[PDB]
CSV table of C-alpha atoms and ligand atoms in Angstrom, one decimal:
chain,number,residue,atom,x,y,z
A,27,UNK,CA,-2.5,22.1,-26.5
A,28,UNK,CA,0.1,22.8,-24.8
A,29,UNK,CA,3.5,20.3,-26.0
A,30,UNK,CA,6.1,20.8,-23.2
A,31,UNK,CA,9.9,20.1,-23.8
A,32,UNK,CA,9.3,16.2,-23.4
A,33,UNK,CA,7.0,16.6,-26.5
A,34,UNK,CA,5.6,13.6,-24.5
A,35,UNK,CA,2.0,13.4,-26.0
A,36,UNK,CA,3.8,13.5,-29.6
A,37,UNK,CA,5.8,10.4,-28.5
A,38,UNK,CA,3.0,8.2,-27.2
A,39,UNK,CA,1.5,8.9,-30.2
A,40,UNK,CA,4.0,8.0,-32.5
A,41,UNK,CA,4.6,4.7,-30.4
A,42,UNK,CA,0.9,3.8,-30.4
A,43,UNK,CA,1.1,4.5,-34.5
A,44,UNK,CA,1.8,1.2,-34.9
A,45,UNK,CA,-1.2,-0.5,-33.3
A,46,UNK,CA,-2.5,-0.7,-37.0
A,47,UNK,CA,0.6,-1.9,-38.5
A,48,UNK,CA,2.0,-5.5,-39.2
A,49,UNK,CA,4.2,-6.6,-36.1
A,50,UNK,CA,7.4,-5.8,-36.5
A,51,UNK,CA,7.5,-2.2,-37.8
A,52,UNK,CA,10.0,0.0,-35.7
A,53,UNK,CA,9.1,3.8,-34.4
A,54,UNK,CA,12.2,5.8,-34.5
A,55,UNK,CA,12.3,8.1,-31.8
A,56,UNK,CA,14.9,11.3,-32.3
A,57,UNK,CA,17.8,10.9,-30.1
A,58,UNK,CA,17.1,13.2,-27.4
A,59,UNK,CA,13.4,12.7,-27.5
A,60,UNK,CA,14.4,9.2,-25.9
A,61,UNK,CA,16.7,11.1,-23.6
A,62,UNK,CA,13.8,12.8,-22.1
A,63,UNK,CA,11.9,10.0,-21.4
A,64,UNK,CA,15.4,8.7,-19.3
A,65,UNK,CA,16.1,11.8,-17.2
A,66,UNK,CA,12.4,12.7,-16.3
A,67,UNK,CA,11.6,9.3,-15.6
A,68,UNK,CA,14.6,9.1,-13.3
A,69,UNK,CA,13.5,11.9,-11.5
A,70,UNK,CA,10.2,10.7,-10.8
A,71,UNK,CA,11.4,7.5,-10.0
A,72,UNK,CA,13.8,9.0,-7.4
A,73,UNK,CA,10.9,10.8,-6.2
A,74,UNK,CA,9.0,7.5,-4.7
A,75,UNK,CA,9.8,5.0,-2.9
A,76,UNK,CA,12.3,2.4,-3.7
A,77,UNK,CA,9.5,-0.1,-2.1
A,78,UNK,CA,6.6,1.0,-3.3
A,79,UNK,CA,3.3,1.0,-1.4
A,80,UNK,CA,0.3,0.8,-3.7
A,81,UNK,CA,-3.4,0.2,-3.7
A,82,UNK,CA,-6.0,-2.2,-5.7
A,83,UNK,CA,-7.2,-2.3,-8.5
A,84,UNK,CA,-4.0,-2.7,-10.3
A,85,UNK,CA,-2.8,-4.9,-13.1
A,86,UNK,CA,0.8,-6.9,-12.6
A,87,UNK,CA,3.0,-8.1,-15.3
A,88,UNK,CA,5.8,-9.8,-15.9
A,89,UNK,CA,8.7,-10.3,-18.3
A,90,UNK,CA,8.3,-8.5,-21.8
A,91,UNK,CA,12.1,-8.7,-22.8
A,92,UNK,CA,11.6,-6.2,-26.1
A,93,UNK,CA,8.4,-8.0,-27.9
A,94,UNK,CA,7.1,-4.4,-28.2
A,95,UNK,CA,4.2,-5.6,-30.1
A,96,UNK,CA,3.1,-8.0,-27.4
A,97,UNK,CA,3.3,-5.0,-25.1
A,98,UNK,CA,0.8,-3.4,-27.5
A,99,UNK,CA,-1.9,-6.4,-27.1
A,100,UNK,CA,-1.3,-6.9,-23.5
A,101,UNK,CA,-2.9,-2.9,-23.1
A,102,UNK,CA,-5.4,-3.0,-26.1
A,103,UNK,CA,-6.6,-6.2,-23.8
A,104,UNK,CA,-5.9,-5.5,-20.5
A,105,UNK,CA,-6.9,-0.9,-21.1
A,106,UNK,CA,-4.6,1.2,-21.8
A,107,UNK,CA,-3.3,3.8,-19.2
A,108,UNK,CA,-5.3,5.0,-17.4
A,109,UNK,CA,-8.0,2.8,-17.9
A,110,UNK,CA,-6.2,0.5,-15.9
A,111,UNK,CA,-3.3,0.9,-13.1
A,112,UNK,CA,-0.3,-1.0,-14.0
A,113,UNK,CA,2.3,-2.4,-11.8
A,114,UNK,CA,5.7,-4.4,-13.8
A,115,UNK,CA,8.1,-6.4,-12.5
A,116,UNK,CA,11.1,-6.1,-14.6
A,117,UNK,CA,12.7,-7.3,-17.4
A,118,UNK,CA,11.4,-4.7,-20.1
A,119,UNK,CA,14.9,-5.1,-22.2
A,120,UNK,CA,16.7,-7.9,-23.8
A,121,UNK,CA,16.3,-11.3,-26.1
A,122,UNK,CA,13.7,-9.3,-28.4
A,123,UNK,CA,13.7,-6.8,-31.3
A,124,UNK,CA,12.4,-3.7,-30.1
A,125,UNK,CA,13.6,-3.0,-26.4
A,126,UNK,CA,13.6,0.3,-27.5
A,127,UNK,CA,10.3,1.0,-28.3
A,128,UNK,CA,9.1,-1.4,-25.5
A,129,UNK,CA,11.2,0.8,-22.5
A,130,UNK,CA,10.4,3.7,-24.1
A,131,UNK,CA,6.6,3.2,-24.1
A,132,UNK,CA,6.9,2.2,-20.5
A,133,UNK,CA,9.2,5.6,-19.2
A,134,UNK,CA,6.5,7.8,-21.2
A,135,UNK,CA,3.5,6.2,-19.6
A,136,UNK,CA,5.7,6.2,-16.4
A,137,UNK,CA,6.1,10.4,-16.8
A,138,UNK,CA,2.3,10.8,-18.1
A,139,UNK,CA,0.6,8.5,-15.0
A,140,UNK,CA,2.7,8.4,-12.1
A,141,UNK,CA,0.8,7.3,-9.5
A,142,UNK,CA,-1.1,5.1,-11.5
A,143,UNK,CA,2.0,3.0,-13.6
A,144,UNK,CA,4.7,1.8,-12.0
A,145,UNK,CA,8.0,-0.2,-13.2
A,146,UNK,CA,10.0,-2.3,-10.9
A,147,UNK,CA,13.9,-3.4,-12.0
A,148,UNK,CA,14.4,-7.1,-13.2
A,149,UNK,CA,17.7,-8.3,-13.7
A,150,UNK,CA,18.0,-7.4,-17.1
A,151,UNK,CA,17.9,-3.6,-15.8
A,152,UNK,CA,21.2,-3.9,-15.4
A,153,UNK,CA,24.6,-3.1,-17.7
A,154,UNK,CA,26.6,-6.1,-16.9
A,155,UNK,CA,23.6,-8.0,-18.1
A,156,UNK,CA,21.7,-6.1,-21.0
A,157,UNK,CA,25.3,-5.5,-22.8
A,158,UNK,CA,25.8,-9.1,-23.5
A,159,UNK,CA,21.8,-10.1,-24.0
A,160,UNK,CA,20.5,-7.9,-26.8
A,161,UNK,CA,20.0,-4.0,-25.8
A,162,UNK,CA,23.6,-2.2,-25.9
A,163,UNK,CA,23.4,-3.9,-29.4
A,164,UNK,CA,20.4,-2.5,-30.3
A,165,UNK,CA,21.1,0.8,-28.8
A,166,UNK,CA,24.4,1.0,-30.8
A,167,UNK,CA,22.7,0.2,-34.0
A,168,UNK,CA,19.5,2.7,-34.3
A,169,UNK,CA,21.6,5.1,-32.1
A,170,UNK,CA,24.6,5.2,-30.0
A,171,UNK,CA,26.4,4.1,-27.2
A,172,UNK,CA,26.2,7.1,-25.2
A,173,UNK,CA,22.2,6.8,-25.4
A,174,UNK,CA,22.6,3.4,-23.6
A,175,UNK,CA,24.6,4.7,-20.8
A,176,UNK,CA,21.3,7.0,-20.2
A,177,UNK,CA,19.1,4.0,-19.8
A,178,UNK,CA,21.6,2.9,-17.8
A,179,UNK,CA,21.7,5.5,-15.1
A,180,UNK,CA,17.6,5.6,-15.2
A,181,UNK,CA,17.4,1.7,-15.1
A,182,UNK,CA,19.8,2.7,-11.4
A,183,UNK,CA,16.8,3.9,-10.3
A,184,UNK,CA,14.5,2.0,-10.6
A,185,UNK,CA,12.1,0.7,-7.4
A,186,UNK,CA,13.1,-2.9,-6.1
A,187,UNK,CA,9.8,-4.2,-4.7
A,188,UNK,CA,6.4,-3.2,-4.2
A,189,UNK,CA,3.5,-4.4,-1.4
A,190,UNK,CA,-0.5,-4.0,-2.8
A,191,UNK,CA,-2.2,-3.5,0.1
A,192,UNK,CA,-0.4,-4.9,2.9
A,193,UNK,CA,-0.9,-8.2,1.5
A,194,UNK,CA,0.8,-9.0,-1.6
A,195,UNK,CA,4.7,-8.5,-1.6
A,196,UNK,CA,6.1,-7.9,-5.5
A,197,UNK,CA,9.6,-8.2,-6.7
A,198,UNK,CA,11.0,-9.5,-9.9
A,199,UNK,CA,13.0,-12.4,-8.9
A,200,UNK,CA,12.4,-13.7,-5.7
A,201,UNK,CA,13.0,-14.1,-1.8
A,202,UNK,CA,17.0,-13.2,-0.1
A,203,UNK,CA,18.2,-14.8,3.0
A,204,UNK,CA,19.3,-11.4,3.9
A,205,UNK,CA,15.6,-10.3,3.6
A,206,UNK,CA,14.8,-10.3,7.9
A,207,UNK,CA,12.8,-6.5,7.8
A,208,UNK,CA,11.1,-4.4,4.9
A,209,UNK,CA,13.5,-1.3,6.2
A,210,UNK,CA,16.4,-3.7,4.8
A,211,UNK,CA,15.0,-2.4,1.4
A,212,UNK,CA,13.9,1.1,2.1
A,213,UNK,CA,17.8,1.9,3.1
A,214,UNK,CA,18.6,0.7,-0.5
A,215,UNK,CA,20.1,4.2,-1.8
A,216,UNK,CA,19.9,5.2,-6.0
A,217,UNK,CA,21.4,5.4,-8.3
A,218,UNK,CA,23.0,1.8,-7.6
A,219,UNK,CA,24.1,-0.5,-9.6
A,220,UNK,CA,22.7,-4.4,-9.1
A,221,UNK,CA,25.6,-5.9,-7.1
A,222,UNK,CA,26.7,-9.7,-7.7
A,223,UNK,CA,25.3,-10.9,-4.6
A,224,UNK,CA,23.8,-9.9,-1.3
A,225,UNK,CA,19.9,-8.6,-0.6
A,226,UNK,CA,19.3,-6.4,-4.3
A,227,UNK,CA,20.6,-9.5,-6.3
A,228,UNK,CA,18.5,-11.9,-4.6
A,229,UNK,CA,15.5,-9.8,-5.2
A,230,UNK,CA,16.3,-9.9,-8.3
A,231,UNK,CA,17.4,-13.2,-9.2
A,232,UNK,CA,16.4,-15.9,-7.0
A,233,UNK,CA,13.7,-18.7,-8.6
A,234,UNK,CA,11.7,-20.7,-6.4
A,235,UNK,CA,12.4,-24.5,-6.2
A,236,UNK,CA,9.6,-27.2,-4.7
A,237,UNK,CA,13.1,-29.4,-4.3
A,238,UNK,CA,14.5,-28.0,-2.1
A,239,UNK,CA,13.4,-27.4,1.3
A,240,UNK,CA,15.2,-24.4,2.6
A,241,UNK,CA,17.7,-22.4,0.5
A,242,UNK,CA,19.5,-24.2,-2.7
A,243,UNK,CA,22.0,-22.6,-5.1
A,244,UNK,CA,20.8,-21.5,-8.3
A,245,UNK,CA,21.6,-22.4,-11.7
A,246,UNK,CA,21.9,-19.0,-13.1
A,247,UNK,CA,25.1,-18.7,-11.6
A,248,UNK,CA,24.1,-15.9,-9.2
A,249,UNK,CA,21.7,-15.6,-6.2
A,250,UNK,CA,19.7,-18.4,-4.5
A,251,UNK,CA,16.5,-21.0,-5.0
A,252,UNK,CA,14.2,-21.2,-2.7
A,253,UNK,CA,11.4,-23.5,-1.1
A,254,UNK,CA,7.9,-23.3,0.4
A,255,UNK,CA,9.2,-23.5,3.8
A,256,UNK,CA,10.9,-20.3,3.3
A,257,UNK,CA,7.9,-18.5,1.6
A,258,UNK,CA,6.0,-20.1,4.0
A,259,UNK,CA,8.2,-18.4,6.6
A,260,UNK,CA,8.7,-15.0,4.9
A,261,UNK,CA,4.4,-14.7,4.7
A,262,UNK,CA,4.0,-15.7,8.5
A,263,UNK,CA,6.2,-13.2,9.4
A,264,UNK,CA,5.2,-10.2,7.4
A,265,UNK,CA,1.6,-10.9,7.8
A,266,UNK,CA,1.2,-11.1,3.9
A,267,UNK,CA,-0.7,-13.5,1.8
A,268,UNK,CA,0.7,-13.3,-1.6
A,269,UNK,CA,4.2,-13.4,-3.3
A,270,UNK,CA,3.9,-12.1,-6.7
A,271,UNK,CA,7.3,-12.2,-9.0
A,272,UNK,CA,8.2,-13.2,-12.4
A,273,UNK,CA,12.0,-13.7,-13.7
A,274,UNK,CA,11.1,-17.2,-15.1
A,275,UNK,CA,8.8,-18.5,-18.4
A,276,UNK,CA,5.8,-20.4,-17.7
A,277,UNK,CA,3.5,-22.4,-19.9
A,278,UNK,CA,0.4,-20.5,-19.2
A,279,UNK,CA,1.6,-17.2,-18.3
A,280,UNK,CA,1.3,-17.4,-14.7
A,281,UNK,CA,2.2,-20.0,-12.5
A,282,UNK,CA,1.6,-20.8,-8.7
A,283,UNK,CA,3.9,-22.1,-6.4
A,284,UNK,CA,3.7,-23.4,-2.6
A,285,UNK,CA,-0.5,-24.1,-2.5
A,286,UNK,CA,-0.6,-20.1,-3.9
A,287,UNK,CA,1.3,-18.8,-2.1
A,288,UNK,CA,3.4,-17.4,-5.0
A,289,UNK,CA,2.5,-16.7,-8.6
A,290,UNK,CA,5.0,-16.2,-10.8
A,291,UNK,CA,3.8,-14.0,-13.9
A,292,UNK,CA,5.8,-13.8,-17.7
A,293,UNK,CA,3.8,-11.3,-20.1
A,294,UNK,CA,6.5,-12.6,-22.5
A,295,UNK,CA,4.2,-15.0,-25.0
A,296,UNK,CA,6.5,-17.2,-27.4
A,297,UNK,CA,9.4,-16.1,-25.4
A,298,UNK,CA,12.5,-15.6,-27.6
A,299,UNK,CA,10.7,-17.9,-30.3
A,300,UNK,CA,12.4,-20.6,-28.1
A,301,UNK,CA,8.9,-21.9,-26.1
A,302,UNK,CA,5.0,-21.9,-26.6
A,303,UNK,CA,4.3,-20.2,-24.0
A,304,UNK,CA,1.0,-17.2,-23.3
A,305,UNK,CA,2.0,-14.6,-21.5
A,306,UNK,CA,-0.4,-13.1,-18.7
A,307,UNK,CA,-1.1,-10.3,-16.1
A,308,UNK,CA,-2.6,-10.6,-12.9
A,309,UNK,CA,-6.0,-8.6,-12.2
A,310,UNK,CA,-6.1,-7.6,-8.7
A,311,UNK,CA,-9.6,-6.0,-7.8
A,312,UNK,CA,-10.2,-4.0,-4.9
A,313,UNK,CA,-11.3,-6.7,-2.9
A,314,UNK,CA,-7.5,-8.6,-3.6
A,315,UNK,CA,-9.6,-11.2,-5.6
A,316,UNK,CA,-6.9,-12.1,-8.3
A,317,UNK,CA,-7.9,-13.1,-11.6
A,318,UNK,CA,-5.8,-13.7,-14.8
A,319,UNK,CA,-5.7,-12.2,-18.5
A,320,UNK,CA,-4.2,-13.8,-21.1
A,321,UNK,CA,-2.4,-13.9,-24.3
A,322,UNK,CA,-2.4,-17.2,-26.0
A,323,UNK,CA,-0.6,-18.1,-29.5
A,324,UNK,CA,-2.9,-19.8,-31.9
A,325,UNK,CA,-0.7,-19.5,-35.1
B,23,UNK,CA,-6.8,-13.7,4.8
B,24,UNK,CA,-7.3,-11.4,2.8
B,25,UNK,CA,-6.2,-12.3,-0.9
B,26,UNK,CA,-8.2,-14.9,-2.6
B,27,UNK,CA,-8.5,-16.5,-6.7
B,28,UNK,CA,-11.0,-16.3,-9.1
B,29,UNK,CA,-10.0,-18.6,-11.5
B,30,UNK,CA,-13.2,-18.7,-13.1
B,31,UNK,CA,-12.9,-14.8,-13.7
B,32,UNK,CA,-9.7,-15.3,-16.3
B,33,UNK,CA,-9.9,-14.3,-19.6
B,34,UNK,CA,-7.9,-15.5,-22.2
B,35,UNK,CA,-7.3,-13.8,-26.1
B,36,UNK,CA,-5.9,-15.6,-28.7
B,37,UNK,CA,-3.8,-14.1,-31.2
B,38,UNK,CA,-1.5,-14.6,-34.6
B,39,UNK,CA,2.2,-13.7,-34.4
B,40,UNK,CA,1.3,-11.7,-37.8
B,41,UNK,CA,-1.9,-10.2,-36.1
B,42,UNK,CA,-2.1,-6.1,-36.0
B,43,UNK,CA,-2.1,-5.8,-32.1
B,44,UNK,CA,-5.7,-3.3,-32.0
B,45,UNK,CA,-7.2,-6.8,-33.1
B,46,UNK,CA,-7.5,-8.1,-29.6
B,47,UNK,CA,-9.2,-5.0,-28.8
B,48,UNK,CA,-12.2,-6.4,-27.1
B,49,UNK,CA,-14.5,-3.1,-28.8
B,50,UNK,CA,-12.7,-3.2,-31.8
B,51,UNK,CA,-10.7,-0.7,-33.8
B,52,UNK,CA,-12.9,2.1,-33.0
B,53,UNK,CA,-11.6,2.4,-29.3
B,54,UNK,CA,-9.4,5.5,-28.8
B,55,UNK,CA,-6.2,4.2,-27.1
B,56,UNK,CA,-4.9,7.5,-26.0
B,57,UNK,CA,-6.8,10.5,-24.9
B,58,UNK,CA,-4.1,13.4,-23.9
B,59,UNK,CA,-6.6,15.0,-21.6
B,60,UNK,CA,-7.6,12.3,-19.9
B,61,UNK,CA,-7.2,12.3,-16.0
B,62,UNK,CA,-7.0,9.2,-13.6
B,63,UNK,CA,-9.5,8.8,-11.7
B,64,UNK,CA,-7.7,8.9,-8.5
B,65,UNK,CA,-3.8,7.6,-7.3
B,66,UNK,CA,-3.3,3.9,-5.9
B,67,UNK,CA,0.4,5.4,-4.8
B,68,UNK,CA,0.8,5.7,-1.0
C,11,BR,BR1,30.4,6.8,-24.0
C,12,BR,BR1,4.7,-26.3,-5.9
C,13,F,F1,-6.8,-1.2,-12.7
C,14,MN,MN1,14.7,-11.9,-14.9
C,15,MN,MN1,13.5,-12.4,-17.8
């Protein structure tokens, strides 16, 4: 049918190829096929909220840091798009192989679903960062460096946080001490850049910490911890039940924190080849029953 | 209030690093991964 100028169906394609292939293999997109995805995904992206309201039934994920074939598994188990709705928290790029293939699957199911697939920015969405930590070397090497200052202005624009139903309140990293009202995020104008401190860093950096009781400092060298008497807080006063972030490797793929009242998910299994760990998403039905899908390494 | 677990609901895949990814297809091989045509069923954007 018809192809349009994004030849966008001919991409997915080509990415999806590879479903039948040994792990590993790369799909080498032309230059300005790539390019595409960036500038209409940017577009859309401008085009809704920077705090995104969504609905149930919705799957969440976490960290995938350029293990495109993990990516692959997690939608053969979890449906791919749009057999389920898909909300991710970040951290698409970086300490993997193939953050190419993995972003770009993720901006071509961002143009082909919009209102059912949704990306949020992690703190490796970010230049300062993803230059040192794997993706302005891989850019340079199967393209150029002008292709990577493309992601970058798209990565800009990414949403910060997202609320499912009034109830669960989604960011990558975690809770600001500047966080007081929901507006505080709205007013967050794009294309920005992640500052090294202040309310957009914190959402994107903090980790919470059952040791300490209010706000700690963290050992990333940016941003802040956090304890349960702050979530604790933060829920009371937004009338929410639920934070759901990532930003940090857990054993089992997801990981609660303050008697459930924050799950931290990593969809990231053998992170880095550095830990055992599955990687998971979060099922959240229409009733916000959450349940949890899993990939596990036998090996 | 509102949001609640179902622990018991999880499901959990195991897989080889060396593993073709369509293997944790839970209907096998023969599942179409992407149909061009097809539509959501309806938005969850507000
Ligand atoms: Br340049
Ligand atoms: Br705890
Ligand atoms: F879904
Ligand atoms: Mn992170
Ligand atoms: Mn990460």
């Amino acid at each position: 049918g018809h192809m349009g100028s994004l030849n966008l169906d001919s991409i997915i394609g080509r990415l999806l190829e590879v479903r039948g292939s040994r792990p590993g293999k790369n799909v080498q997109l032309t230059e300005n096929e790539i390019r595409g995805l960036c500038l209409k995904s940017r577009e859309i992206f401008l085009s809704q909220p920077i705090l995104l309201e969504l609905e149930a039934p919705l799957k969440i994920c976490g960290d995938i840091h350029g293990q495109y074939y993990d990516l692959l598994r997690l939608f053969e188990y979890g449906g791919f798009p749009p057999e389920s709705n898909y909300l991710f928290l970040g951290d698409y790029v970086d300490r993997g192989k193939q953050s190419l293939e993995t972003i770009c699957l993720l901006l071509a199911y961002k143009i082909k679903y919009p209102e059912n697939f949704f990306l949020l920015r992690g703190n490796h969405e970010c230049a300062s960062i993803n230059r040192i930590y794997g993706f302005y070397d891989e850019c340079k090497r199967r393209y150029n460096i002008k292709l990577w200052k493309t992601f970058t202005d798209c990565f800009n624009c990414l949403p910060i946080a997202a609320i499912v139903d009034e109830k669960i309140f989604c960011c990558h990293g975690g809770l600001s001490p500047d966080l007081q009202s929901m507006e505080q995020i709205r007013r967050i104008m794009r294309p920005t850049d992640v500052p090294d401190q202040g309310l957009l860093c914190d959402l994107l950096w903090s980790d919470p910490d059952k040791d300490v009781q209010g706000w700690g400092e963290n050992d990333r060298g940016v941003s802040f911890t956090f304890g349960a008497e702050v979530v604790a807080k933060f829920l009371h006063k937004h009338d929410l039940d639920l934070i759901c972030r990532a930003h940090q490797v857990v054993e089992d793929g997801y990981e609660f924190f303050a008697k459930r009242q924050l799950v931290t998910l990593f969809s990231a299994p053998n992170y880095c080849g550095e830990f055992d760990n599955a990687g998971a998403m979060m099922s959240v039905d229409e009733t916000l029953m959450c349940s949890f899908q899993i990939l596990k390494p036998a090996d | 209030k509102k949001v609640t677990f179902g622990l018991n609901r999880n499901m959990t895949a195991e897989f080889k690093k060396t593993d073709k990814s369509i293997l944790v297809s839970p209907t096998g091989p023969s599942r179409v991964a992407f149909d061009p045509e097809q539509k959501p069923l309806h938005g969850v954007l507000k």
